[PDB]
Amino acid sequence: PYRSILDASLELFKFTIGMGELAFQEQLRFRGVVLLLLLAYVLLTYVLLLNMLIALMSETVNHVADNSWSIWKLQKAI
Amino acid sequence: GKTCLMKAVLNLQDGVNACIMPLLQIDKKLLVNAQCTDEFYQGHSALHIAIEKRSLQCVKLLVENGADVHLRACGRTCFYFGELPLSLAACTKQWDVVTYLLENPHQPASLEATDSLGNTVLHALVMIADNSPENSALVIHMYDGLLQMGARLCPTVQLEEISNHQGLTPLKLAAKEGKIEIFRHILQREFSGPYQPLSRKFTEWCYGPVRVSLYDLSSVDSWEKNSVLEIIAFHCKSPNRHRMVVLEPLNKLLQEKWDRLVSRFFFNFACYLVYMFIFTVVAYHQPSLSMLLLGHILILLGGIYLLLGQLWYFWRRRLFISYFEILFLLQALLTVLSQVLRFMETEWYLPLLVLSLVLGWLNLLYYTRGFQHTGIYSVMIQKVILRDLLRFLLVYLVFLFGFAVALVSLSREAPYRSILDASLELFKFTIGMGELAFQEQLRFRGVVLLLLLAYVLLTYVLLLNMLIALMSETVNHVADNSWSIWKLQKAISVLEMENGYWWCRRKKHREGRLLKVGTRPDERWCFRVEEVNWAAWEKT
Amino acid sequence: LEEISNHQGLTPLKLAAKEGKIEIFRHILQREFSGPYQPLSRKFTEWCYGPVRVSLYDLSSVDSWEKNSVLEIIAFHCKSPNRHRMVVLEPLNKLLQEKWDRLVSRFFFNFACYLVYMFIFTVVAYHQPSLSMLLLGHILILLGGIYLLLGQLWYFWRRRLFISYFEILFLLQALLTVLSQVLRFMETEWYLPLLVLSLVLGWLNLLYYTRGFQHTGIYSVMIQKVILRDLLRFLLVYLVFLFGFAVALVSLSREA
Amino acid sequence: SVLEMENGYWWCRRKKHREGRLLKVGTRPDERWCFRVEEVNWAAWEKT
Ligand SMILES: CCCCCCCCCC(=O)OC[C@H](COP(=O)([O-])OCCN)OC(=O)CCCCCCCCC
Ligand SMILES: CCCCCCCCCC(=O)OC[C@H](COP(=O)([O-])OCCN)OC(=O)CCCCCCCCC
Numbered sequence: 075p076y077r078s079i080l081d082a083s084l085e086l087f088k089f090t091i092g093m094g095e096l097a098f099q100e101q102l103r104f105r106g107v108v109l110l111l112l113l114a115y116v117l118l119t120y121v122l123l124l125n126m127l128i129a130l131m132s133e134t135v136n137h138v139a140d141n142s143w144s145i146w147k148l149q150k151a152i
Numbered sequence: 153g154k155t156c157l158m159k160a161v162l163n164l165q166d167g168v169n170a171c172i173m174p175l176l177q178i179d180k181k182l183l184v185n186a187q188c189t190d191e192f193y194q195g196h197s198a199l200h201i202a203i204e205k206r207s208l209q210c211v212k213l214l215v216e217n218g219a220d221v222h223l224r225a226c227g228r229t230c231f232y233f234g235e236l237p238l239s240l241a242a243c244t245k246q247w248d249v250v251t252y253l254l255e256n257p258h259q260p261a262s263l264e265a266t267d268s269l270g271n272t273v274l275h276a277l278v279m280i281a282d283n284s285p286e287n288s289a290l291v292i293h294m295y296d297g298l299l300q301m302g303a304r305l306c307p308t309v310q311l312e313e314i315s316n317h318q319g320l321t322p323l324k325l326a327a328k329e330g331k332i333e334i335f336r337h338i339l340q341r342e343f344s345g346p347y348q349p350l351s352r353k354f355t356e357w358c359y360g361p362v363r364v365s366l367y368d369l370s371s372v373d374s375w376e377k378n379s380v381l382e383i384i385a386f387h388c389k390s391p392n393r394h395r396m397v398v399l400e401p402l403n404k405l406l407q408e409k410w411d412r413l414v415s416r417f418f419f420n421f422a423c424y425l426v427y428m429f430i431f432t433v434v435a436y437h438q439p440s441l442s443m444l445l446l447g448h449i450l451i452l453l454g455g456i457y458l459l460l461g462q463l464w465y466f467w468r469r470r471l472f473i474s475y476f477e478i479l480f481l482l483q484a485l486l487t488v489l490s491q492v493l494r495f496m497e498t499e500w501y502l503p504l505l506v507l508s509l510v511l512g513w514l515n516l517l518y519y520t521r522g523f524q525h526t527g528i529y530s531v532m533i534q535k536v537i538l539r540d541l542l543r544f545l546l547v548y549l550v551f552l553f554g555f556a557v558a559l560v561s562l563s564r565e566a567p568y569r570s571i572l573d574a575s576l577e578l579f580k581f582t583i584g585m586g587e588l589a590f591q592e593q594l595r596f597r598g599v600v601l602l603l604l605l606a607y608v609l610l611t612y613v614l615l616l617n618m619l620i621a622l623m624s625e626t627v628n629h630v631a632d633n634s635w636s637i638w639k640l641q642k643a644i645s646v647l648e649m650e651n652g653y654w655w656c657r658r659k660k661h662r663e664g665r666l667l668k669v670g671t672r673p674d675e676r677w678c679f680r681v682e683e684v685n686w687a688a689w690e691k692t
Numbered sequence: 693l694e695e696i697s698n699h700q701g702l703t704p705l706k707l708a709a710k711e712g713k714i715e716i717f718r719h720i721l722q723r724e725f726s727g728p729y730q731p732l733s734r735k736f737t738e739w740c741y742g743p744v745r746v747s748l749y750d751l752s753s754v755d756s757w758e759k760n761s762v763l764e765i766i767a768f769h770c771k772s773p774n775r776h777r778m779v780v781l782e783p784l785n786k787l788l789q790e791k792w793d794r795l796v797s798r799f800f801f802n803f804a805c806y807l808v809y810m811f812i813f814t815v816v817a818y819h820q821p822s823l824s825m826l827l828l829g830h831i832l833i834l835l836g837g838i839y840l841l842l843g844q845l846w847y848f849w850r851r852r853l854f855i856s857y858f859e860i861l862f863l864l865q866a867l868l869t870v871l872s873q874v875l876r877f878m879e880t881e882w883y884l885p886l887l888v889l890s891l892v893l894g895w896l897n898l899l900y901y902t903r904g905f906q907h908t909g910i911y912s913v914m915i916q917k918v919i920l921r922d923l924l925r926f927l928l929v930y931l932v933f934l935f936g937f938a939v940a941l942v943s944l945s946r947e948a
Numbered sequence: 949s950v951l952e953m954e955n956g957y958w959w960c961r962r963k964k965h966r967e968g969r970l971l972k973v974g975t976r977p978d979e980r981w982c983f984r985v986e987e988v989n990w991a992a993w994e995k996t
Pocket of ligand 2: 806
């Protein structure tokens with residue numbers, strides 16, 4: 075568990091597809107600090123996802139349906 | 153505490169009363185100087201009472217009676233206008249009182265007189281202003297009239313360059329109060345007639361659609377010890393900070409500062425990213441039990457330098473007490489604490505080193521405001537997301553501890569062995585990992601399942617509420633606001649670094665070039681904006 | 693003529709509020725006359741000094757001191773959706789601000805004395821034996837439950853025509869706490885589940901006081917108004933799907 | 949919230965207090981209770 079950069083990176087990325095475990099595993103020393111860091115990582119990943127969603131919504135609000143049809147006509151011209 | 157003079161100065165037919173003159177004649181202490189002494193209003197006399205009534209005849213009679221216009225009121229919701237009778241004309245949009253109060257018979261009542269609160273007539277006209285368009289127009293017209301009249305009374309005195317008790321000129325006071333309506337008029341003020349020396353904006357030569365626009369940078373170029381830019385960045389407190397920055401020539405001056413200070417901003421970014429990378433490398437190869445020693449001494453020097461680089465910031469800017477400005481101090485402090493704890497109680501040093509590394513990797517996001525294609529992106533994280541997620545998380549923790557204690561109390565008969573385990577299991581239903589089981593090893597499995605179902609429903613309710621709040625904020629949001637606040641952030645960045653690093657104390661350089669118009673010499677610093685405007689040209 | 697009640701006992705000023713007819717109500721409340729009809733006016737100006745305007749208002753049958761007034765009718769007896777719109781209009785907004793700035797000293801006391809009860813309930817539940825100070829908690833939670841039970845029955849004894857989301861939960865939680873502390877003497881097997889079900893309802897009812905803070909009032913609205921109005925409809929359809937698919941799966945999975 | 953608590957707690961039955969102050973205008977005496985709002989309005993004043 076977390077033997078190298080690759081394993082830890084994979085475990086942290088696992089909290090995107092909603093699969094990673096958030097455990098107070100005590101086989102590894104400083105379990106409290108590990109749990110706190112994982113909690114902070116989860117919070118920051120949710121912050122980033124919320125920021126991406128808000129950016130997409132801001133783009134959608136300023137968007138217009140006729141613009142999509144116009145750019146599709148441009149693509150057909152190309 | 154009202155005297156017979158106040159009763160005479162009271163309202164009467166046609167806004168005048170012959171008893172006011174008869175009372176003064178019958179007196180021959182002056183009855184005109186009599187004023188109330190109550191805590192609600194002390195010093196309010198007939199001189200201001202008649203002026204507030206907009207009675208030109210009564211004011212003229214009182215002046216002829218020997219009333220001293222230089223007398224100032226005091227005392228306590230009320231009118232925040234100045235105590236000077238000359239500033240009392242702000243209660244009249246037609247300047248009827250001021251028309252006589254300037255060059256009156258045997259009572260000059262000069263505008264240069266300072267009020268009891270310090271602010272002059274021009275400063276009072278900006279303090280008593282409002283953001284409403286009607287109030288804005290009323291303030292602008294009165295300010296223009298007062299400035300024009302100033303050229304015919306004590307013309308050698310610069311009425312717009314006198315500071316109050318706080319040390320701020322009306323130009324600085326308008327920025328501090330965040331009163332953008334009057335501030336825009338003051339900053340871009342121009343006159344075509346004899347008031348040309350009083351103007352700030354000038355046009356040099358219009359060639360086709362190209363317009364050269366000069367501006368006056370007096371007390372605005374940030375070279376002086378106290379200017380508009382420094383007040384807006386740090387001393388101001390109004391939400392309108394992000395709106396004043398857009399207005400020219402502040403935008404152009406900030407652009408010129410940025411295009412000359414990127415050469416140091418990117419150097420700072422590189423020399424901080426190198427420190428972060430070295431910190432990461434040292435942490436990764438940290439022993440569990442020569443080059444590594446070099447890293448530790450470097451991270452000690454690197455931490456100390458950054459610690460001083462932020463204490464110097466908090467030693468300054470005392471009234472400014474900025475989100476990232478505390479984290480850099482905190483990360484440097486924790487790094488120094490860790491490198492000190494390496495000599496005593498070494499068991500805790502590595503956790504502190506990791507907690508410093510994570511804060512460094514998060515503080516690296518500060519420099520994202522320096523790139524044009526990431527400035528807008530860097531705004532929404534700080535402004536709204538961190539303002540709503542904290543409120544969401546507090547409610548979530550309130551739910552979490554309560555449900556954890558409930559589960560621990562319920563599961564006490566024939567997993568969830570303590571508060572910590574139950575809290576972790578309940579929090580697990582956020583990353584979509586926790587199990588929702590009818591586990592029968594623990595007694596009351598039905599009630600446990602019902603409570604877990606209720607917890608899941610309430611967590612979804614809280615998440616939906618957070619999403620709806622974010623959507624409500626997004627709908628009311630505007631794309632130009634993000635760019636404006638990013639420009640404000642760039643202004644904050646440049647004004648800090650223009651003062652120079654703490655160790656070097658880089659000397660300041662005066663912006664613009666010396667230009668003179670008319671004659672007071674009138675030599676002054678100016679900054680040359682060139683703009684193309686077909687619509688404005690079409691009015692010729 | 694404006695102070696005569698109908699068969700229902702309501703004056704036209706009160707009737708306009710009850711019907712939620714904000715258009716006429718705003719005119720009636722802020723009515724003013726400059727001529728001989730000055731005594732008929734309600735709004736007055738005393739002295740205008742520069743931009744500062746002093747505006748007097750008539751609080752006859754509006755100050756909530758009388759046995760039946762505009763405020764009480766709007767809060768409880770009214771049924772129109774326009775209740776949230778009449779409150780903004782002055783001087784009702786100013787009167788409510790003055791009442792709030794004088795009753796926060798009791799609202800926060802109530803919040804503290806309910807949070808203490810909730811904390812004691814939590815502590816007693818956590819250390820509850822599976823088989824002196826603990827006995828003190830049980831008698832306190834019994835007295836605390838009874839007091840809150842009476843504090844809500846007194847509400848439902850009143851406000852008969854008003855039959856409020858939180859007002860039923862506080863009664864329900866107190867009733868369940870009392871029921872649990874009674875069942876501790878007979879059929880004790882079920883007492884702990886009821887104690888936990890009361891604790892969770894207490895921790896949810898704690899959210900009622902969030903309306904007392906200016907920086908949480910807006911936040912506390914959207915939960916009650918819309919989310920609980922739509923999630924119930926979503927969950928009913930979800931359960932309809934759930935039971936059907938569950939029966940289908942059980943019927944289908946009957947062979948190796 | 950305020951109208952419920954102004955009636956007082958069930959056990960104590962707190963006495964009510966009349967809001968505002970007594971003011972009289974014109975003559976019917978016309979003594980009545982009034983509440984004094986102070987507001988600043990430049991736009992309304994500009995109509996004078
Ligand atoms: C030259 C070799 C330097 C080796 C690394 C030394 C430690 C650097 C630590 C570090 O991150 O400093 C950042 C800082 C600039 O960013 P900032 O202060 O704006 O970032 C924080 C803003 N809130 O850095 C500076 O201001 C100094 C940059 C180096 C110039 C030489 C300094 C000599 C001192 C006597
Ligand atoms: C003084 C020590 C009291 C020890 C705790 C007693 C049990 C308190 C239970 C409790 O939560 O009561 C809340 C209530 C106030 O909130 P509310 O009724 O508005 O909350 C519900 C709103 N829907 O409380 C009150 O109204 C009373 C507060 C205490 C004052 C003394 C009372 C004496 C009675 C004879």
